[PDB]
Scaffold this active site. Structure first.
Site, mmCIF file in Angstrom:
data_model
loop_
_atom_site.group_PDB
_atom_site.id
_atom_site.type_symbol
_atom_site.label_atom_id
_atom_site.label_comp_id
_atom_site.label_asym_id
_atom_site.label_seq_id
_atom_site.Cartn_x
_atom_site.Cartn_y
_atom_site.Cartn_z
ATOM 1 N N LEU A 53 0.779 -1.176 -0.126
ATOM 2 C CA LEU A 53 0.044 0.018 0.172
ATOM 3 C C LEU A 53 0.761 1.011 0.179
ATOM 4 O O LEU A 53 2.005 1.293 0.454
ATOM 5 C CB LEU A 53 -0.819 0.146 1.342
ATOM 6 C CG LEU A 53 -1.770 -1.152 1.502
ATOM 7 C CD1 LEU A 53 -2.718 -1.049 2.441
ATOM 8 C CD2 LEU A 53 -2.421 -1.615 0.094
ATOM 9 N N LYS A 63 6.984 -3.277 11.775
ATOM 10 C CA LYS A 63 6.106 -3.134 13.096
ATOM 11 C C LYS A 63 4.934 -3.963 12.930
ATOM 12 O O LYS A 63 4.382 -4.526 13.705
ATOM 13 C CB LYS A 63 5.823 -1.582 13.264
ATOM 14 C CG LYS A 63 7.029 -0.790 13.762
ATOM 15 C CD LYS A 63 6.574 0.692 13.913
ATOM 16 C CE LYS A 63 7.936 1.339 14.651
ATOM 17 N NZ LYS A 63 9.025 1.481 14.066
ATOM 18 N N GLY A 180 -16.719 15.021 15.881
ATOM 19 C CA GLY A 180 -16.249 15.639 17.040
ATOM 20 C C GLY A 180 -16.365 16.795 17.322
ATOM 21 O O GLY A 180 -16.080 17.487 18.560
ATOM 22 N N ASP A 181 -16.960 17.797 16.219
ATOM 23 C CA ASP A 181 -17.247 19.066 16.656
ATOM 24 C C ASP A 181 -18.217 19.440 15.392
ATOM 25 O O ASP A 181 -18.621 18.576 14.503
ATOM 26 C CB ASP A 181 -16.055 20.043 16.598
ATOM 27 C CG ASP A 181 -15.384 20.034 15.170
ATOM 28 O OD1 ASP A 181 -15.803 19.531 14.037
ATOM 29 O OD2 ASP A 181 -14.321 20.877 15.077
HETATM 30 N N1 LIG Z 1 -5.197 19.644 9.310
HETATM 31 C C1 LIG Z 1 -6.361 19.961 8.679
HETATM 32 C C2 LIG Z 1 -7.637 20.025 9.559
HETATM 33 C C3 LIG Z 1 -8.686 20.290 9.098
HETATM 34 N N2 LIG Z 1 -8.915 20.554 7.963
HETATM 35 C C4 LIG Z 1 -10.124 20.935 6.929
HETATM 36 C C5 LIG Z 1 -10.771 19.576 6.517
HETATM 37 C C6 LIG Z 1 -11.453 19.107 8.037
HETATM 38 O O1 LIG Z 1 -12.744 18.122 7.270
HETATM 39 C C7 LIG Z 1 -12.273 20.328 8.275
HETATM 40 C C8 LIG Z 1 -12.791 20.461 9.602
HETATM 41 O O2 LIG Z 1 -11.974 20.061 10.525
HETATM 42 P P1 LIG Z 1 -11.980 19.099 11.796
HETATM 43 O O3 LIG Z 1 -10.831 19.082 12.665
HETATM 44 O O4 LIG Z 1 -13.201 19.601 12.326
HETATM 45 O O5 LIG Z 1 -12.380 17.817 11.119
HETATM 46 P P2 LIG Z 1 -13.596 16.850 10.731
HETATM 47 O O6 LIG Z 1 -13.544 16.342 9.177
HETATM 48 O O7 LIG Z 1 -14.829 17.640 10.873
HETATM 49 N N3 LIG Z 1 -13.601 15.672 11.554
HETATM 50 P P3 LIG Z 1 -14.142 15.636 13.462
HETATM 51 O O8 LIG Z 1 -14.425 16.922 13.553
HETATM 52 O O9 LIG Z 1 -13.153 14.964 14.185
HETATM 53 O O10 LIG Z 1 -15.388 14.999 13.236
HETATM 54 O O11 LIG Z 1 -10.885 21.392 8.053
HETATM 55 C C9 LIG Z 1 -7.728 20.679 7.077
HETATM 56 O O12 LIG Z 1 -7.883 20.806 5.779
HETATM 57 N N4 LIG Z 1 -6.487 20.253 7.384
HETATM 58 MG MG LIG Z 2 -13.543 21.881 13.545
HETATM 59 MG MG LIG Z 3 -15.111 18.728 12.356
#
Ligand SMILES: Nc1ccn([C@H]2C[C@H](O)[C@@H](COP(=O)(O)OP(=O)(O)NP(=O)(O)O)O2)c(=O)n1
Ligand SMILES: [Mg+2]
Ligand SMILES: [Mg+2]
Length: 323
Positions: A53, A63, A180-181
């Site tokens: 991959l 690992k 998560g948010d």
């Molecule tokens: N290093 C990063 C972090 C985030 N983002 C972008 C892509 C992500 O989908 C969005 C929102 O960030 P997030 O930390 O809330 O991630 P999420 O995809 O919504 N996942 P989660 O909030 O944990 O459910 O910002 C990005 O481009 N690069």
């Molecule tokens: Mg976010």
């Molecule tokens: Mg998010």
DNA sequence: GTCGG
DNA sequence: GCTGATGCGC
DNA sequence: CCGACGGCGCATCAGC
């Protein structure tokens, strides 16, 4: 998950490299390998199979062989025993405490939740809110609650100015059953790449959401990005909902498709896609896709799919971007 | 840590 | 105050 | 081998 033992091991290695070693490219490499293995549709039988991959190399293959043979990784077993690594890894779980601050706090003898609570005066504003909601911020949000939050945000934005458009992006837009948010993309016709014909466009929305007690706290706030805390209202005699992280990003309205591509993610999908763009001679950010000559002028974009077309990718629906 | 030239 | 680096986060 | 690894907003600080 088919290879959950392996991907968990790699994530723990990634976190160690980021938080303790401060080796950001090792962190990214481990997460890339964990991502590609996560979507591999077979139960991996050997390191050699995984090394086929992309993103899995010789060291991760070795690992995987150790983990498959024994169920564990001696490298991690030692890290878990190490007090300084354990402390630093804990402190970085507070929003606003990164690798550098966590190591600094440990140097000063601040290394437990009890220590942090006793030393709030040594925290900046962001860290202080991260500590306040430490437990709440580690809970996940059921999609059913995300739907209630969506309805509040969109309706309150509508009351400020019916010309706002608020789009919930992030894992929610990818169809996740929990998030998560909450991530909200905001546009208004007064704010374009050509002019800002109206001030306080983000502020007005933040203010309205605070007024109805949806936004409870602010971690940071500028003209285009808000980072804070929100909470669903609960009913009479009902236990309160956990406080939740919320991010709001105001993007130029003519640049919505690049913005919604970025904010839908995932972060690893964005990294893979922008890296591919470079190999194709383009650079992508949340505003534009531009050719590499040094970046040229923005190319016309009238859908998310136009961006995929430029870099010669077949279109991928948001639900298929959870790398 | 992995990969491409 | 301004500018550029750095930390931390999306 | 070895340079590159996605791209950028906000907070904080150092130097002038
Ligand atoms: N290093 C990063 C972090 C985030 N983002 C972008 C892509 C992500 O989908 C969005 C929102 O960030 P997030 O930390 O809330 O991630 P999420 O995809 O919504 N996942 P989660 O909030 O944990 O459910 O910002 C990005 O481009 N690069
Ligand atoms: Mg976010
Ligand atoms: Mg998010």
């Amino acid at each position: 998950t088919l290879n959950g033992g392996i991907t968990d091991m790699l994530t723990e290695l990634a976190n160690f490299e980021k938080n303790v070693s401060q080796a950001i490219h090792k962190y990214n490499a481990y997460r890339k390998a964990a991502s590609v293995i996560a979507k591999y549709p077979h139960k991996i039988k050997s390191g050699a199979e995984a090394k086929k991959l992309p993103g899995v190399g010789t060291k991760i293959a070795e690992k995987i062989d150790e983990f498959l043979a024994t169920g564990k990784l001696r490298k991690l077993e030692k890290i878990r025993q190490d007090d300084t690594s354990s402390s630093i890894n804990f402190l970085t779980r507070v929003s606003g405490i990164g690798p550098s601050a966590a190591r600094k706090f440990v140097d000063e003898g601040i290394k437990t939740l009890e220590d942090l609570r006793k030393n709030e005066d040594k925290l900046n504003h962001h860290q202080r809110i991260g500590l306040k909601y430490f437990g709440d911020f580690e809970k996940r949000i059921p999609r059913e609650e995300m739907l209630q939050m969506q309805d509040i945000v969109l309706n309150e934005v509508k009351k400020v100015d019916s010309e706002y458009i608020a789009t919930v992006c992030g894992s929610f837009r990818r169809g996740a059953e929990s998030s998560g948010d909450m991530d909200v993309l905001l546009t208004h016709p007064s704010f374009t790449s050509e002019s800002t014909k109206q001030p306080k466009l983000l502020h007005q929305v933040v203010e309205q959401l605070q007024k109805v007690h949806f936004i409870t706290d602010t971690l940071s706030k500028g003209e285009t990005k808000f980072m804070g805390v929100c909470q669903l209202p609960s009913k009479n005699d009902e236990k309160e909902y956990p406080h939740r992280r919320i991010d709001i990003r105001l993007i130029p309205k003519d640049q919505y498709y690049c913005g919604v591509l970025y904010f839908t993610g995932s972060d690893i999908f964005n990294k893979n896609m922008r890296a591919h763009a470079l190999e194709k001679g383009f650079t992508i950010n949340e505003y534009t896709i531009r050719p590499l000559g040094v970046a040229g002028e923005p190319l016309p974009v009238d859908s998310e799919k136009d961006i995929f077309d430029y870099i010669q990718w077949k279109y991928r629906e948001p639900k298929d971007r959870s790398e």
